[PDB]
Amino acid sequence: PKIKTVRGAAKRFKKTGKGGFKHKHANLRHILTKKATKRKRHLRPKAMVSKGDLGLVIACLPYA
């Protein structure tokens, strides 16, 4: 039968133009007042998945 997508993974990752994956950064959820503005700002934009854990992501999302 068809491979099932890891649905959590689907929620967290979007495949990009060159076949990478963007994700929202961790740590910008709560406990914010203590985090510096700068840090928060840096966390805001979506970022590419690293070369190391790309494989895992791919495994999770076969249909991507």
Binding site: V6, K11, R12, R29, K46, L56, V57
Partner: peptide, 18 residues
């Protein structure tokens, strides 16, 4: 997405959008 007992990359990261 099982990285030993460590919180796996997808569980680590926030869900986004709709």
């Amino acid at each position: 997405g099982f990285e030993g007992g460590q919180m796996p990359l997808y569980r680590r990261l926030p869900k986004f959008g709709f």
